[PDB]
């Protein structure tokens, strides 16, 4: 599809659930084919958006 | 759950009024009468400790502003002091705040065993009160010589600033910690 | 004597009644001799006390070794308006050492009168006692003793029947290891973050409130009441040319019956551990390692722990100085890597994060210890660890960075084969399980 | 025939007042004359037996818009039989 | 000789007369010598890295600049 | 040897001008003028992160370390007062090692977000890392991260890339005059914020963008609009207010 | 070709390294912070007449 | 004016009457290094730029759009003045601002703050 702009297309992707306090995002599954590694400290009540990917991460429980 | 930021809760808000007490004014004046009048900021630590005792062991944002007003400084100069030190509980804590042994001089004799019992039996997640605020678990730093390995520290915030005590118990055991927690729940203080 | 620097006859000790034998509030203090003939002690000039300190050969106690008389001499002789304060480092930080809590609980008037003697020695104006926040009982006992002293008339205006006045106040911190530092003490007492300031503005020039102040340890000033009344030669002839004063020791660790009595400071480790505190758990045979002094000291193994003294010069010559003089023995039944890793984590926990080499270096050391404890590291990691410790030490604002780099350096200098064995067994397991 | 030997020889053999300044380095040997004794210097360097510089590689040019003598032309030379390189340069002007 | 040419073995064809035919023969012989040098370089090919390491004038490996801070800084300030 | 940037040394009295040696070179500086300023007069430029000419002097970040012959350990040139006749030299291998170690420590926890950093082309951290700093860092474990707070609609903050130099704190305390910014916490993990949800409401509060070397504090309206190298810089004056 | 993430977000973050390294000066980029919050390109065009396909 | 070099430079006579500014670029505020200072530049006022109405590119009609930026950097003010007068340009020199080194010691954060006199 191409009717949806990427800004409106990334928002519908469900946020990832992480058990820990910080999660490292590397883009693609292969580290060398994604963006530089980014450690995000997810502590607020809102999802933490990866600045490169746009992926969102939500902490469920410690 | 140690956070350096507020995210205001309905329990504690900056606009909520907070004074020390009618009787505590004498203590405030006495503690302020230790330093030169221009250096009223030197009493920030004792005033914060007194506010923590008066509130119940947890220091809210309103009491921080009240202390800042008393010493006539910017409010953040009190937030910095309160956050830096390890004896200013910023989140709500129960009346009898229990504590765990220190890391390097205590764990040598194998004191990790007791804290497992404290967190597992009759306990909830660390830093959390029960259905009602009675007990809580935190980290504690040893006074000195760990001549006795298992040591539990309690803080008496039940009676406020008048009945505030800071006692240390040595030779604690999974059964001894039990009998002491029911003794505290009953009300009578244990011996040390 | 000189062949052996040992033997306490139970009347050569200074801190009598350190077990709460008698009520140490006013009557016991008066009985043992506290507040005795203090009128002439403080009325016999000011430079006499400084000369007494200089010739008595007093050493820095409970911290960096430094001649106490020379340090006191740095205070201004004529005051250009700025009042002189005297803050006592009553903070008993670095857990594992309790040589000050016991003194506070059982000899309050000792230190309380030592404050007055030191203040008249350096023309001070007021005394500040900074007790830990976790010493509520000790603080209450000390303030009760101070209230009794105020009632008697030994302090305040016209102290001890002398024209000179004095003041002793009680300030209690809030439980930070860095707050025990000689400058973070002043920063916290000023009522702000307890982060040490830089060295060139020495406290003797501009300290508390910007006024010339001097920081002394509680037990370093608590031997001042007994340096004049009992004379200087009563203890200065106990030890070495500059190492004398009957330093207190707090033995602890994996040894049965841990005593805490004071002794001569030039005592061999073997004699002190097999005479007073029974013997090492399991005997002298195990004797994995020992730390002379507190937890801020480089490690000393079984090879060189014997036939050396608790003297600052010789211990420094064994690249492992004397700190607060509270040793912790290590037996063969406990791994030394885990204890040193826990020491590194303790240093990481209390670093006030001001200067860069300590702020991130103390965390990097902890991560390296966690990796190496289970053998997850490689063989080449030891040299990088040495380089990291060398980078940390010498570049920090205060000495905590050195205190955090010393234990790991001592471990990798005296227990390198243990790390190599752990690495080798991890590698062989890795190659065995496919 | 190497850098140092040529430096000694051209320091001794060359008549003075020709080379305003000279350099010796691994990058290249330089002979900065004074924009008038150029034909003479090149003629000597071409015909002398111990310096048989025969081929002129190129004539460079550098524009420095900060000095009084704005331009600076560079003469690259080469001695085939001695297997050595000499870089003679001057200072020019826009008029 | 600039690169590794002392190790390599080859001949330098030199003409006798300056006519065009000898230049053609010289070029043919130069092609022969180039083939010989290619064979020698193919035979004597060592292993190791291709980019320099002494100075910082080479980009970091794209599998390295994505997890290191100094490497990413070098990549940025070089490109 | 002209002073770096042509800075004019201010002599209150020519009699009070001590002489120090930087690198085989004597120079005259009056009372005060900590070692860093003595090198500034001598023409040698010293790396710095925390020291600013208009704010106070703080000894953290330990980057301006130099070597003095009469000194057991390297001293901070940004806070060491000038003494008559020192040997303050920076060419020694010990100074290079100290600077390399300090930069390794600074870049230990720095995030890899250079391509998205608004201060990418003009960052003081990477410019000094290229010049005064060893390559091929050794850190490989997880690096600390902190959450992005909110303060003002004209100062966009990303504190995961903050080196705790306390420059903004000192600016807010001294020059701005309103004390709403401060350094909270203890040890590695100390966030520099307000502890509440207040915004920076000061007249000259937008100057924290310039003083903060790394791209932690950057302007929000200009966020992600252009890079440094593609802007033509011209020097004009102001017309809004009468101070010109 | 401008590739994009498997999720659907475009891979370009307007870092402008390509614009600053292009020897032919073919690439012209204009960036802007989206209302989402992340940085992206609003105008990223390449002059294929200037481009030399050098792979820089 | 001594603009005889303008007759020989071959540049068009219309650009021989430009008004230029000679100045030393100031240190950028965002970065604390002083490595780009001490250099003087000639600032041709090439302020005429517009937008191509197909792709938004920036167009120019003035050949001196970036000459003074990319090239033509002088080491001294007198060199720039001599160059401008030789090429015949109405140069207007602008003096550079320089920071003033004031005495500031570390032991200034710790003062008396005054005596508690009644106020
Ligand atoms: C990080 C750090 C913490 C310290 N904590 C204490 C302490 O808790 N108690 C103490 O007596 N000395 C402590 N010291 C040593 C101090 O330097 C010492 O108290 C002070 O210099 C007075 O020395 P003196 O006993 O010779 O008078 C500490 C030093 C450092 C670097
Ligand atoms: S070395 Fe550590 S404890 Fe000492 S000032 Fe620096 S950060 Fe603070
Ligand atoms: S602040 Fe500097 S080093 Fe950090 S990401 Fe931005 S440009 Fe890179
Ligand atoms: S926000 Fe900027 S100025 Fe403030 S401490 Fe961090 S790096 Fe320094
Ligand atoms: S701006 Fe250019 S180099 Fe940077 S991500 Fe986008 S296409 Fe790639
Ligand atoms: S040694 Fe156990 S609590 Fe400190
Ligand atoms: S620049 Fe001097 S210590 Fe930071
Ligand atoms: Zn990502």
Curated annotation (Swiss-Prot), chain A:
<protein>
    <recommendedName>
        <fullName>NADH dehydrogenase [ubiquinone] iron-sulfur protein 6, mitochondrial</fullName>
    </recommendedName>
</protein>
<dbReference type="GO" id="GO:0005739">
    <property type="term" value="C:mitochondrion"/>
</dbReference>
<comment type="subunit">
    <text>Complex I is composed of at least 49 different subunits. This is a component of the iron-sulfur (IP) fragment of the enzyme.</text>
</comment>
<dbReference type="GO" id="GO:0006120">
    <property type="term" value="P:mitochondrial electron transport, NADH to ubiquinone"/>
</dbReference>
<comment type="similarity">
    <text>Belongs to the complex I NDUFS6 subunit family.</text>
</comment>
<keyword id="KW-0813">Transport</keyword>
<keyword id="KW-0809">Transit peptide</keyword>
<keyword id="KW-0249">Electron transport</keyword>
<keyword id="KW-0679">Respiratory chain</keyword>
<comment type="function">
    <text>Accessory subunit of the mitochondrial membrane respiratory chain NADH dehydrogenase (Complex I), that is believed not to be involved in catalysis. Complex I functions in the transfer of electrons from NADH to the respiratory chain. The immediate electron acceptor for the enzyme is believed to be ubiquinone.</text>
</comment>
<dbReference type="GO" id="GO:0005743">
    <property type="term" value="C:mitochondrial inner membrane"/>
</dbReference>
<keyword id="KW-0496">Mitochondrion</keyword>
Curated annotation (Swiss-Prot), chain D:
<keyword id="KW-1278">Translocase</keyword>
<comment type="subunit">
    <text>Complex I is composed of at least 49 different subunits. This is a component of the iron-sulfur (IP) fragment of the enzyme.</text>
</comment>
<dbReference type="GO" id="GO:0045271">
    <property type="term" value="C:respiratory chain complex I"/>
</dbReference>
<keyword id="KW-0496">Mitochondrion</keyword>
<keyword id="KW-0249">Electron transport</keyword>
<protein>
    <recommendedName>
        <fullName>NADH dehydrogenase [ubiquinone] iron-sulfur protein 3</fullName>
        <ecNumber>7.1.1.2</ecNumber>
    </recommendedName>
</protein>
<keyword id="KW-0830">Ubiquinone</keyword>
<dbReference type="GO" id="GO:0005743">
    <property type="term" value="C:mitochondrial inner membrane"/>
</dbReference>
<keyword id="KW-0520">NAD</keyword>
<keyword id="KW-0560">Oxidoreductase</keyword>
<comment type="function">
    <text>Core subunit of the mitochondrial membrane respiratory chain NADH dehydrogenase (Complex I) that is believed to belong to the minimal assembly required for catalysis. Complex I functions in the transfer of electrons from NADH to the respiratory chain. The immediate electron acceptor for the enzyme is believed to be ubiquinone.</text>
</comment>
<comment type="similarity">
    <text>Belongs to the complex I 30 kDa subunit family.</text>
</comment>
Swiss-Prot record, chain F:
<feature type="binding site">
    <location>
        <position position="212"/>
    </location>
    <ligand>
        <name>[4Fe-4S] cluster 2</name>
    </ligand>
</feature>
<feature type="binding site">
    <location>
        <position position="78"/>
    </location>
    <ligand>
        <name>[2Fe-2S] cluster</name>
    </ligand>
</feature>
<comment type="function">
    <text>Core subunit of the mitochondrial membrane respiratory chain NADH dehydrogenase (Complex I) that is believed to belong to the minimal assembly required for catalysis. Complex I functions in the transfer of electrons from NADH to the respiratory chain. The immediate electron acceptor for the enzyme is believed to be ubiquinone. This is the largest subunit of complex I and it is a component of the iron-sulfur (IP) fragment of the enzyme. It may form part of the active site crevice where NADH is oxidized.</text>
</comment>
<feature type="binding site">
    <location>
        <position position="165"/>
    </location>
    <ligand>
        <name>[4Fe-4S] cluster 2</name>
    </ligand>
</feature>
<feature type="binding site">
    <location>
        <position position="50"/>
    </location>
    <ligand>
        <name>[2Fe-2S] cluster</name>
    </ligand>
</feature>
<comment type="subunit">
    <text>Complex I is composed of at least 49 different subunits. This is a component of the iron-sulfur (IP) fragment of the enzyme.</text>
</comment>
<comment type="similarity">
    <text>Belongs to the complex I 75 kDa subunit family.</text>
</comment>
<feature type="binding site">
    <location>
        <position position="162"/>
    </location>
    <ligand>
        <name>[4Fe-4S] cluster 2</name>
    </ligand>
</feature>
<feature type="binding site">
    <location>
        <position position="61"/>
    </location>
    <ligand>
        <name>[2Fe-2S] cluster</name>
    </ligand>
</feature>
<feature type="domain" description="2Fe-2S ferredoxin-type">
    <location>
        <begin position="16"/>
        <end position="94"/>
    </location>
</feature>
<feature type="binding site">
    <location>
        <position position="64"/>
    </location>
    <ligand>
        <name>[2Fe-2S] cluster</name>
    </ligand>
</feature>
<feature type="binding site">
    <location>
        <position position="114"/>
    </location>
    <ligand>
        <name>[4Fe-4S] cluster 1</name>
    </ligand>
</feature>
Swiss-Prot record, chain H:
<dbReference type="GO" id="GO:0006970">
    <property type="term" value="P:response to osmotic stress"/>
</dbReference>
<keyword id="KW-0809">Transit peptide</keyword>
<dbReference type="GO" id="GO:0009536">
    <property type="term" value="C:plastid"/>
</dbReference>
<dbReference type="GO" id="GO:0022900">
    <property type="term" value="P:electron transport chain"/>
</dbReference>
<comment type="similarity">
    <text>Belongs to the complex I NDUFS4 subunit family.</text>
</comment>
<dbReference type="GO" id="GO:0009631">
    <property type="term" value="P:cold acclimation"/>
</dbReference>
<keyword id="KW-0679">Respiratory chain</keyword>
<protein>
    <recommendedName>
        <fullName>NADH dehydrogenase [ubiquinone] iron-sulfur protein 4, mitochondrial</fullName>
    </recommendedName>
</protein>
<keyword id="KW-0999">Mitochondrion inner membrane</keyword>
<dbReference type="GO" id="GO:0008137">
    <property type="term" value="F:NADH dehydrogenase (ubiquinone) activity"/>
</dbReference>
<keyword id="KW-0249">Electron transport</keyword>
<dbReference type="GO" id="GO:0005743">
    <property type="term" value="C:mitochondrial inner membrane"/>
</dbReference>
């Amino acid at each position: 599809r191409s009717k949806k702009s990427p800004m409106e297309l990334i928002s519908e992707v469900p946020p990832i659930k992480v058990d820990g306090r910080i999660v490292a995002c590397e883009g693609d599954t292969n580290p060398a084919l994604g963006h530089p590694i980014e450690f995000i400290c997810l502590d607020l009540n809102e999802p933490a958006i990866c600045k490169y990917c746009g992926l969102r991460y939500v902490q469920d429980h410690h | 759950t140690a956070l350096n930021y507020h995210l205001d809760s309905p329990d504690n808000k900056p606009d909520l009024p907070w004074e020390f007490s009618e009787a505590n004014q004498s203590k405030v004046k006495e503690i302020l009468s230790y330093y030169p009048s221009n250096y009223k900021q030197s009493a920030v630590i004792p005033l914060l400790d007194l506010a923590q005792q008066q509130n119940g062991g947890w220091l809210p944002v309103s009491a921080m502003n009240a202390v800042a007003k008393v010493i006539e400084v910017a409010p953040i100069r009190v937030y910095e002091v309160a956050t830096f030190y390890s004896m200013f509980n910023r989140a709500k804590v129960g009346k009898y705040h229990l504590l765990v042994c220190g890391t390097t001089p205590c764990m040598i004799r194998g004191s990790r065993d007791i804290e497992s019992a404290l967190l597992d039996h009759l306990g909830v997640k660390r830093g959390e009160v029960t259905k009602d605020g009675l007990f809580s678990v935190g980290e504690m730093e040893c006074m000195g010589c760990c001549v006795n390995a298992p040591m539990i520290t309690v803080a008496d915030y039940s009676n406020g600033s008048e009945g505030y005590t800071y006692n240390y118990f040595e030779d604690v055991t999974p059964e001894k910690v039990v009998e002491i927690v029911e003794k505290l729940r009953k009300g009578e203080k244990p011996p040390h | 004597e000189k062949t052996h620097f040992g033997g306490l006859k139970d009347e050569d000790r200074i801190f009598t009644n350190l077990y709460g034998l008698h009520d140490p509030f006013l009557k016991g203090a008066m009985k043992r001799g506290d507040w005795h003939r203090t009128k002439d002690l403080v009325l016999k000039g000011t430079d006499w006390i400084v000369n007494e300190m200089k010739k008595s050969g007093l050493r820095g106690r409970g911290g960096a070794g430094f001649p106490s008389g020379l340090k006191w001499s740095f205070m201004p002789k004529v005051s250009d308006g700025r009042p002189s304060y005297l803050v006592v480092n009553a903070d008993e930080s670095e857990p594992g050492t309790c040589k000050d809590r016991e003194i506070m609980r059982h000899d309050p008037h000792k230190l309380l009168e030592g404050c007055l003697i030191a203040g008249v020695g350096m023309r001070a104006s007021a005394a500040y006692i900074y007790i830990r926040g976790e010493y509520v009982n000790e603080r209450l006992n000390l303030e009760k003793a101070r209230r009794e002293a105020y009632a008697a008339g030994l302090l305040g205006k016209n102290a001890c029947g002398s024209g000179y006045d004095f003041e002793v106040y009680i300030h209690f911190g809030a439980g930070a290891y860095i707050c025990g530092e000689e400058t973070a003490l002043l920063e916290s007492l000023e009522g702000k973050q307890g982060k040490p300031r830089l060295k060139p503005p020495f406290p003797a020039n501009a300290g508390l409130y910007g006024c010339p102040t001097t920081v002394t340890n509680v037990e370093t000033v608590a031997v001042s009441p007994t340096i004049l009344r009992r004379g200087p030669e009563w203890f200065s002839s106990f030890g070495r040319k500059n190492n004398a004063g009957t330093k207190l020791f707090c033995i602890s660790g994996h040894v049965n019956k841990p005593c805490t009595v004071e002794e001569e400071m030039s005592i061999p480790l073997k004699e002190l551990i097999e005479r007073h505190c029974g013997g090492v758990r399991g005997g002298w045979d195990n004797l994995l390692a020992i730390i002379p002094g507190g937890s801020s000291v480089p490690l000393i193994p079984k090879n060189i722990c014997e036939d050396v003294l608790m003297d600052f010069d010789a211990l420094k010559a064994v690249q492992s100085g004397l700190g607060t003089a509270a040793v912790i023995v290590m037996d063969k039944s406990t791994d030394v890597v885990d204890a040193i890793a826990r020491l590194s984590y303790f240093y990481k926990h209390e670093s006030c994060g001001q200067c860069t080499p300590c702020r991130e270096g103390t965390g990097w050391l902890w991560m390296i210890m966690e990796r190496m404890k289970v053998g997850n590291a490689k063989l080449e990691e030891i040299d990088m660890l040495q380089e990291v410790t060398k980078q940390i030490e010498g570049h920090t604002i205060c000495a905590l960075g050195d205190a955090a780099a010393w234990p790991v350096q001592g471990l990798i200098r005296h227990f390198r084969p243990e790390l190599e064995r752990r690495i080798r067994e991890r590698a062989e397991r890795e190659l065995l399980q496919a | 025939m190497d850098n140092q030997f040529i430096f000694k020889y051209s320091w001794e053999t060359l008549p003075k007042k020709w080379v305003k300044k000279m350099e010796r380095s691994e990058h290249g040997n330089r002979f900065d004359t004074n924009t008038d004794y150029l034909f003479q210097l090149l003629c000597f360097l071409k015909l002398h037996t111990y310096t048989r510089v025969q081929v002129l590689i190129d004539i460079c040019g550098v524009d420095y818009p900060s000095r009084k003598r704005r331009f600076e032309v560079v003469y690259n030379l080469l001695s085939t039989r001695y297997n050595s390189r000499i870089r003679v340069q001057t200072s020019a002007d826009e008029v | 000789p600039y690169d590794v040419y002392d190790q390599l073995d080859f001949d330098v064809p030199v003409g006798t007369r300056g006519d065009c035919y000898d230049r053609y023969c010289i070029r043919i012989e130069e092609m022969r010598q180039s083939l010989r040098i290619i064979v020698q370089c193919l035979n004597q090919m060592p292993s190791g890295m291709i980019k320099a390491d002494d100075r910082k004038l080479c980009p970091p490996s794209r599998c390295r600049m994505k997890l290191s801070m100094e490497s990413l800084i070098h990549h940025f300030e070089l490109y | 040897r002209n002073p770096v940037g042509g800075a004019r040394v201010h002599f209150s009295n020519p009699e009070d001008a001590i002489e120090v040696f930087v690198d085989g070179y004597a120079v005259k500086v009056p009372k005060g003028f900590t070692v860093l300023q003595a090198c500034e007069v001598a023409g040698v430029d010293i790396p710095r992160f925390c020291y600013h000419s208009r704010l106070s002097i703080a000894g953290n970040c330990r980057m301006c370390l130099v070597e003095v012959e009469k000194s057991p350990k390297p001293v901070a040139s940004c806070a060491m007062p000038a003494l008559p006749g020192m040997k303050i030299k920076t060419d020694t291998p010990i100074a290079k090692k100290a600077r390399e170690g300090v930069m390794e420590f600074l870049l230990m926890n720095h995030p890899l977000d250079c391509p998205i950093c608004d201060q990418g082309g003009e960052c003081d951290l990477q410019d000094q890392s290229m010049a005064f700093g060893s390559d091929r860092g050794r850190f490989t474990e997880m690096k600390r991260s902190v959450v992005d707070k909110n303060l003002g609609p004209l100062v966009k903050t990303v504190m995961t890339r903050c080196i705790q130099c306390t420059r903004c704190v000192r600016f807010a305390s001294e020059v701005a005059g309103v004390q709403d910014l401060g350094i909270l916490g203890r040890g590695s993990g100390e966030e520099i914020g307000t502890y509440v949800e207040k915004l920076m409401t000061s007249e000259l509060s937008g100057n924290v963008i310039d003083i903060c070397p790394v791209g932690a504090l950057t302007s929000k309206p200009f966020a992600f609009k252009a890079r440094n190298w593609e802007l033509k810089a011209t020097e004009t004056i102001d017309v809004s207010d009468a101070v010109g | 070709a401008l590739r994009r993430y498997p999720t659907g977000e475009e891979r370009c973050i307007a870092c402008k390294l390509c614009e600053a390294v292009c020897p032919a000066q073919a690439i012209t980029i204009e960036a802007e912070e989206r209302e989402d919050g992340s940085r992206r390109t609003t105008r990223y065009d390449i002059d294929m007449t200037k481009c030399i396909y050098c792979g820089f | 004016k001594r603009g005889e070099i303008g007759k020989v430079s071959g540049i068009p006579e219309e650009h021989l009457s430009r008004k230029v500014i000679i100045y030393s670029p100031a240190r950028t505020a965002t970065q604390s290094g002083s490595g780009k200072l001490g250099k003087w530049k000639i600032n041709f006022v090439s302020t005429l730029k517009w937008e191509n109405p197909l792709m938004g590119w920036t167009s120019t009609g003035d050949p001196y759009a970036n000459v003074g930026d990319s090239a033509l950097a002088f080491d001294s003010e007198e060199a720039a003045k001599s160059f401008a007068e030789r090429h015949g340009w109405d140069y207007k020199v602008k003096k550079p601002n320089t920071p003033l080194l004031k005495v500031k010691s570390y032991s200034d954060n710790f003062k008396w703050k005054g005596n508690p006199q009644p106020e």
